[PDB]
DNA sequence: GGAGGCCAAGATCTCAAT
DNA sequence: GACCCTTCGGGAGGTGCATCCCGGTCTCGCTTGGCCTCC
RNA sequence: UUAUCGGCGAGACCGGGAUGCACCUCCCGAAGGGUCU
């Protein structure tokens, strides 16, 4: 049982984006910032932890082996517990007196739950944020505009029947009229919404009620729209993402890692390298990364760490260096006493 | 018998967070503030003191020795006394007030209980809070949202058998229904809660009773669910933490420290450097720090202190300078008259 | 605090006897520290005069600065009044935890009997917590109707 | 459990996708290899024909 | 054998709360 | 090496879901006799 | 200022689990021209 520190960097082969609920606002899409509004963004360690945990879940599922039909022996509750640490069966207790010593056996039988814990069992794996090395390594990507298919290309008009061409005519006319109505409602909506800065405290509730009623009227105007509910032609708001080729410093660790647990974690990293995609916006191929981590250990009471090896993930392959890491992976693979159920 | 003042800084490698009972509210998780609601946060000296006290306890456990089975000679009571400072059997040598040199023998034989003390024995070690140097060196981290692994990744459905697929469908339908019901109950509850500001206290009591009963209704509705009591899909509320790279100024002191007790404290700092983690939310690797302390002593009656050396804790190692600190460590490691039981 | 500092200054100045024991006995120690006379051997000046103890004030500077019972002290030390308006806050806090429920590596050190003792301790703590919570609930119920009581 | 069947029936909506149905195809940006590979073009001016 | 020193015993009960 | 002439517009979404728990301390501001060892 | 003298103090890690994600072509038209070894 030794602590392994994974110090390294993440290089983005494609833009890297994420939509954290608190990070975004009504102004638009934003990355979570390290400090305040005008601070350097970071890629959350929560997303990296989730991706690596689901990679480890798939590693365990493949190791267990599927049946002839291709089904897994695990129950739905067991899949949920391994990949998301959720006890749908309602059996998890945080401070059971009898569980005081039963944690060790559960860890020894279930490497994934030991690594990535659950409610009541601490997880040995800590995965930190990714913080860019330089400045101006983020930007606004993805901005676009959905078009009308049949106005951009008129050669598709001859495919439609005569009755459907009238359907498109009604679509376009209804889009125009509904858009002008909704834009008028919006421009009066924002006109009084700007009054929020300097307004009476008592009238503040009514201004909230006024804007809410305007929203109801907008929804009612959209509801009476027949052919389509939402206009086809619209600009797409951009999202904020790290630039291609950004260098993000990342730090991971496993506290008191058994050889089997460290092997499971490295196997999760190896499986993650098949699809090294973090974050969201899978379309536009956002999220593809290329990372190298240097594994170091530190025996308490010593003064200097020891380097075990380096884990390099590249689009051309995965490199594991150092006899220790190979020993860890082997130790994980050759253990048949695991019970993930 | 000297006073050692550890003046230095704690540099943050990963966000530093802590949950203090009196600091967190229903509104959200907040760091403890340096007086007031709008003041600058700080990292509690209690957390640092506890971490260093447990590090010193493990130093003592390793120094005493472990048998072939890896068991320490200390029973449960000794462990609780050395780490928590609490006695369970009631055998602690209570010193009636008025005793001359009350802890003399205990302090001479037990450097850990001399440094950190217990009830009735003042500890020589005082570990203060960490104060940031600048402004906006804190922010809301964490965030994110738990998600159905089978709604996100459809390829996971292939593992599930038909019965479990149907169980998943029932689980999701139940989650939606319960969410709607609890939502309505919450709307009524917050209506009464916004009515709680009524001047009449009697009404406020009545509203509190009704809010309590509505919370019971929410719990009842959650119990009615059969698949999973808790909703799987839910946003995760952020926690407040110091940003990465925050510089926090720290002060620690040992009052009338012999060579042996100072050596034990320095060995605790050395062992702390192996896992330099403060605070919680370690699942996101929060809490890694690097710190450097300048050790000074001040002989009473003189006008200036004298610097003894410097302790630098970095991810690349522990640096200790000055022959006096080495002398302290050697004095601790070469004194064989310590009885920790 | 400053009187203790002055007492320490005097102790350092006077030094230690040849045997290494402090030359102050309990009576002199309490005269210098607390200002009480425990054996009744102190001079009792007449109440009429104000400029009393001139000889004692000349010989013992500490008693002159910080007085004793029967001799007013020359040192006045005032309060430390804050300047701002939000310069106080609820510090400290925290919460004592269980060293074996927080760090699982510590359980490896315990033997089987000690682990059983820990389990018994946790169970007893939970049971007592529940029982005491019930008693406090009943006590608070009494308190609420106490004002309405005759 | 309806995605699999739907994706098998409709390869196009499987590839590119729709609201609520993830698309398997990701098509990233095109980044120039070198430098000074972009410039102002077109321009010109409309002129009286006559 | 005072003489120093410790320890247990003696009545009933105290409302103020951002 | 003299100078014209600087454009129009369309269109901006929709959803979920908001957790569980511990566990709240000990003194003391007096005097005197009974009794244990001590010089 | 109805006198005088008196530090309130000691011990305590609040911590544990969670991928925020899904769909969208921004397009359309335009000679920059003319005088002088």
TrEMBL record, chain D:
Part of the intact protein present: 101 to 150 of 343
Annotated source species: Klebsiella pneumoniae
Name of the protein this chain belongs to: CRISPR type AFERR-associated protein Csf2
Source domain of life: Bacteria
